[PDB]
Design an enzyme around this catalytic site. Structure first.
Site, mmCIF file in Angstrom:
data_model
loop_
_atom_site.group_PDB
_atom_site.id
_atom_site.type_symbol
_atom_site.label_atom_id
_atom_site.label_comp_id
_atom_site.label_asym_id
_atom_site.label_seq_id
_atom_site.Cartn_x
_atom_site.Cartn_y
_atom_site.Cartn_z
ATOM 1 N N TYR A 1 45.891 28.119 65.172
ATOM 2 C CA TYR A 1 46.855 27.153 64.627
ATOM 3 C C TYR A 1 48.127 27.039 65.440
ATOM 4 O O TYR A 1 48.938 26.137 65.224
ATOM 5 C CB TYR A 1 47.256 27.548 63.202
ATOM 6 C CG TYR A 1 46.426 26.861 62.162
ATOM 7 C CD1 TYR A 1 45.114 27.241 61.951
ATOM 8 C CD2 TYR A 1 46.943 25.816 61.406
ATOM 9 C CE1 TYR A 1 44.334 26.618 61.005
ATOM 10 C CE2 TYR A 1 46.167 25.175 60.456
ATOM 11 C CZ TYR A 1 44.855 25.593 60.264
ATOM 12 O OH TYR A 1 44.052 24.986 59.338
ATOM 13 N N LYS B 1 36.595 38.358 61.227
ATOM 14 C CA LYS B 1 35.331 38.369 61.952
ATOM 15 C C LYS B 1 35.481 39.299 63.167
ATOM 16 O O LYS B 1 35.296 38.890 64.318
ATOM 17 C CB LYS B 1 34.907 36.951 62.374
ATOM 18 C CG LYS B 1 33.531 36.892 63.066
ATOM 19 C CD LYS B 1 32.347 36.846 62.079
ATOM 20 C CE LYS B 1 30.994 36.846 62.836
ATOM 21 N NZ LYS B 1 29.801 36.580 61.973
ATOM 22 N N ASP C 1 31.886 35.738 57.334
ATOM 23 C CA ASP C 1 30.724 34.953 56.950
ATOM 24 C C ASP C 1 30.108 35.502 55.670
ATOM 25 O O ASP C 1 29.718 34.745 54.784
ATOM 26 C CB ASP C 1 29.688 34.852 58.086
ATOM 27 C CG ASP C 1 29.273 36.212 58.647
ATOM 28 O OD1 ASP C 1 30.035 37.194 58.538
ATOM 29 O OD2 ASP C 1 28.157 36.295 59.200
ATOM 30 N N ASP D 1 42.437 29.167 55.631
ATOM 31 C CA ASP D 1 42.204 27.744 55.406
ATOM 32 C C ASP D 1 40.847 27.553 54.730
ATOM 33 O O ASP D 1 40.733 26.922 53.669
ATOM 34 C CB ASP D 1 42.206 27.011 56.750
ATOM 35 C CG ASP D 1 41.985 25.512 56.601
ATOM 36 O OD1 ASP D 1 42.489 24.968 55.615
ATOM 37 O OD2 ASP D 1 41.320 24.887 57.452
HETATM 38 CA CA LIG Z 1 42.763 23.371 53.895
HETATM 39 CA CA LIG Z 2 26.262 34.866 59.977
#
Ligand SMILES: [Ca+2]
Ligand SMILES: [Ca+2]
Ligand SMILES: NC(=S)c1ccc[n+]([C@@H]2O[C@H](COP(=O)([O-])OP(=O)(O)OC[C@H]3O[C@@H](n4cnc5c(N)ncnc54)[C@H](OP(=O)(O)O)[C@@H]3O)[C@@H](O)[C@H]2O)c1
Ligand SMILES: NC(=S)c1ccc[n+]([C@@H]2O[C@H](COP(=O)([O-])OP(=O)(O)OC[C@H]3O[C@@H](n4cnc5c(N)ncnc54)[C@H](OP(=O)(O)O)[C@@H]3O)[C@@H](O)[C@H]2O)c1
Lengths: 415, 415
Positions: free
Chosen positions: B159, B229, B282, B306
């Site tokens: 961002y 992640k 995930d 987000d």
């Molecule tokens: Ca959003």
């Molecule tokens: Ca995955």
């Protein structure tokens, strides 16, 4: 030396003009996988053999050939051999292969072995179809509305693995270059700061989107949706979107719908109009829950595809039964999409559904659609029969609890 | 000159020692917002005034002061004035402010005005609470199980807006530096390639996680989950996770639970054990559907936050009623979290719920908890009464359709 044994009976699949030539007795390399790989892989082998046997009345038979990667590779090839060169050579040579889940070590500076396989073999398509199987327990009200196919870009994005650790000489060097040579003013805290690089290219984007559109054509799907966060990442995510629409216009005669930005592409085989459209990633994660029926084929970058494929799998109660392929121009690697779940390894307990449906994708990829259809039929029947593994059973009233191996048999029983 | 009018009656909120000093007659700047801002903002003003009036029997009253950003700013200040300097000055000076949705122009090289406000004012916390309101239509079976608070890092990550366009001289220069000076071999296609930079710092991470933990303490929450992640992005996402756990240990006496990696932090006020844990991004997008009850306060980076905040809002049928705050050490900006939906602008049709619940957050931030509680009470009653705007009504059997302004009144009626 090599510890791989090439099967005595069996012949190599070949590739001519982007078309696979599959003999009646193809050699298929497989990686057992670590942890629960020992449970799910044998169930897959049995189910596949049974579908193939039934489909073609003994005329065809796979010659399975074990190859190695992960923890088992270290046991076979020695201490630091997590991914032997020969494994890459063999997957490329034999064209089609399948794997269980893989152990990547922590503390030794080794990056994801799953990503290593994808990048080294240039398997630039991560293909994840997500559908609902009637009778699967699901946290959503209408899981049957979800029938999507995810085309996830596999070769670029932050997955490239390009980054430097905070306070390392390399990180300081990069930050120095960005601030002093590139005039970057937007790094909020330039000290004790890690840095990663996100690439996205025209060629990388277009080969991925090209595949997604050809798939929609070949399978008479209704739309391709480019999913991106291009409003914030203009030159990577936004460029992916623009290149995607451009490919549609330039190679598939895409034409403006109304005032845009959506396009229509005429299916040259069926005359159906395929809609090419786009949705911003955060909104898309809402839309898959709220308006799933409006979506079909999805094309997106690496990280977004990771998140989208997993979010969709959870909808259809498919966290342990989501299939996956990694496809390039020269070979393809089908895979269990779950982890190694070592706490259950060897207990013959976990769901072999994921790797079995990836094997369904493999058979279809081979042109053995009859055997693939038998697997789908078996899976549908077994789940509808409420004869299922613990992950499904615990969420269901009056189901019958089956072991991993037993669920494999139930699939065969329902073929 | 300035076109802002400082209210005749009213006094400025001050800040002493990290504590707001709010007078009985605080001046609160507000930005009307573009598109449906014209619909939702007046409903918010009326509902807030009514809650304040009722809560404190006329002793307290907000002096609303209009300030500008977006399309309306160009109409007030001229052609290219999308974000006037005075708006930044006024938000910092008056400490607490609220905004409708904003129009950012396309084609003029201007970046998100929402992100501009957050970065320029160093509002490093994006705070998004997600709960279920009984009677809201939802696509999931058990939305009532979702009660989470998202702490999204606002100052770093992709961002930052650091990127260069494919084929630009700057992009080639960066790529040249990476390949030749940094020895980068992992850019799959270095030609026609866009490049973005992802920073993550110890200071950026720790101020965000510090806030998340202090919030869990102050509100007697059960756990803080670091979502990341880090298995793929070791030095940004993985560093965020490590720095988060480290902050817990160093500042809040976090102690290993079992063999780790989770920690326990003792609530100094209630003696409750708060669990500090982590989930890969995930998987987390699956867990919020499958095991929502296990999660409470979430701490994560900009992009992940987000996606997570939006995915959760969709669960609770709250796509048009999700509140949001942006909080820094010197001021705070509360916001409608939906877009400008220009097709409905002026029709008095859309859901004012989002901006009204952000105003509930604003009142609570001000220490006016009684008025905030009245808004929650009103919202609960109106929705339970099935007297709602079109977005809810179309998903419901036998509800009563209300205009935007009318739903505002229904909230007041239920206080
Ligand atoms: Ca959003
Ligand atoms: Ca995955
Ligand atoms: N270094 C390595 S190997 C590493 C590290 C992190 C992430 N990853 C990757 O991230 C993904 C997730 O891996 P992970 O290690 O974090 O998860 P795992 O520990 O392997 O699995 C987590 C949970 O998922 C459920 N599960 C997994 N496979 C299942 C099956 N076949 N049937 C039923 N339930 C199943 C089980 O849930 P319940 O216990 O609730 O029944 C299991 O405990 C994988 O793709 C993996 O490769 C790898
Ligand atoms: N340059 C600008 S301004 C730009 C561009 C892209 C994204 N964004 C940002 O991305 C986010 C989404 O914005 P957008 O422009 O893509 O979406 P919008 O066109 O503003 O809204 C999309 C749809 O969301 C629904 N919706 C929005 N607000 C609602 C409300 N209060 N009540 C009921 N339904 C509502 C409506 O759905 P239905 O039609 O189905 O009823 C609306 O058509 C915003 O935060 C925005 O700032 C901004």
């Amino acid at each position: 030396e090599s510890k791989v044994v090439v099967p005595a009976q069996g012949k190599k699949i070949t590739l001519q003009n982007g078309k696979l030539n599959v003999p009646e007795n193809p050699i298929i390399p497989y990686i057992e996988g670590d942890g629960i790989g020992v449970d799910v892989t044998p169930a897959m082998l049995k189910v596949v053999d049974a579908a193939v046997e039934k489909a073609y009345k003994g005329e065809r038979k796979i010659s399975w050939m074990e190859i190695y990667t992960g923890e088992k590779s270290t046991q076979v090839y020695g201490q630091d051999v997590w991914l032997p060169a020969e494994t890459l050579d063999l997957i490329r040579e034999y064209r089609v292969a399948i794997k269980g889940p893989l152990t990547t070590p922590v503390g030794g500076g080794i990056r994801s072995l799953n990503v290593a396989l994808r990048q080294e073999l240039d398997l630039y398509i991560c293909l994840r179809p997500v559908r609902y199987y009637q009778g699967t327990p699901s946290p959503v009200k209408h899981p049957e509305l979800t029938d999507m196919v995810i085309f996830r870009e596999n070769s670029e994005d932050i997955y490239a693995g390009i980054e430097w650790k905070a306070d390392s000489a390399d990180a300081e060097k990069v930050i120095k270059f960005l601030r002093e040579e590139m005039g970057v003013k937007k790094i909020r805290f330039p000290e004790h700061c890690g840095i990663g690089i996100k690439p996205c290219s025209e060629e990388g984007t277009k080969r991925l989107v090209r595949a997604a559109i050809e798939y929609a054509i070949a399978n008479d799907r209704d739309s391709v949706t480019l999913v991106h966060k291009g409003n914030i990442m203009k030159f990577t995510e936004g460029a992916f979107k623009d290149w995607g629409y451009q490919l549609a216009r330039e190679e598939f005669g895409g034409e403006l719908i109304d005032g845009g930005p959506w396009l229509k592409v005429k299916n040259p085989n069926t005359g159906k109009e395929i809609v090419i459209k786009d949705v911003i990633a955060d909104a898309f994660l809402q839309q898959i829950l709220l308006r799933p029926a409006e979506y079909d084929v999805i094309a997106c970058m690496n990280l977004n595809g990771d998140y989208i494929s997993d979010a969709l799998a959870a909808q259809v109660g498919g966290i342990g039964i989501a299939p996956g392929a990694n496809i390039g121009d020269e070979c393809a690697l089908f895979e269990a999409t779950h982890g190694t779940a070592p706490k259950y390894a060897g207990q013959d307990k976990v769901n072999p559904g994921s790797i079995i449906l990836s094997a369904e994708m493999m058979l279809r990829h081979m042109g053995w659609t009859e055997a693939a259809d038998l697997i789908v039929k078996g899976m549908e029947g077994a789940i509808n029969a409420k004869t299922v593994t613990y992950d499904f059973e615990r969420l269901m009233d009056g189901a019958k609890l089956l072991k991993c191996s037993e669920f494999g048999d139930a699939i065969i029983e329902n073929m």
